Fold Histidine kinase CKI1.
Amino acid sequence: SSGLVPSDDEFLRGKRVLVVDDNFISRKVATGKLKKMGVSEVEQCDSGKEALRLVTEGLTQREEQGSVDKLPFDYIFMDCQMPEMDGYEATREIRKVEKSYGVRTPIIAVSGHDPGSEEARETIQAGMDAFLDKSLNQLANVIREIESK
Ligand code: BEF
Ligand SMILES: [Mg+2]
């Protein structure tokens, strides 16, 4: 399954995206798909803490410069299961950093399996926007749904 949490080679043109995944191969695969959809800029990192850092720094910079776009990333694809700080905790911390800027980055949970009851709960509590099977086959639909909302 894939959905909201309570060709296409120009599909993401104009867009800047962050891929977060502790697995080297998953990360490359995601960035590949996205580059194929015309993504203007893909950034990738290998942990929740790194993600947190890039987002924190990017929001501060954009605020300091009076940037037109205040979000450093139009979308973040967040792997759920990672050592140390998982995707839930990182997303929770990202939402807390965001409060002071009055913005909300779309964050899409990425996992190799459908969530159980506990993960599903964490999904909502963390403040993720959507959830995407790692095939990434539903990527464009999930983003359209986010955009409609
Ligand atoms: F390590 Be993940 F939640 F695909
Ligand atoms: Mg992982």
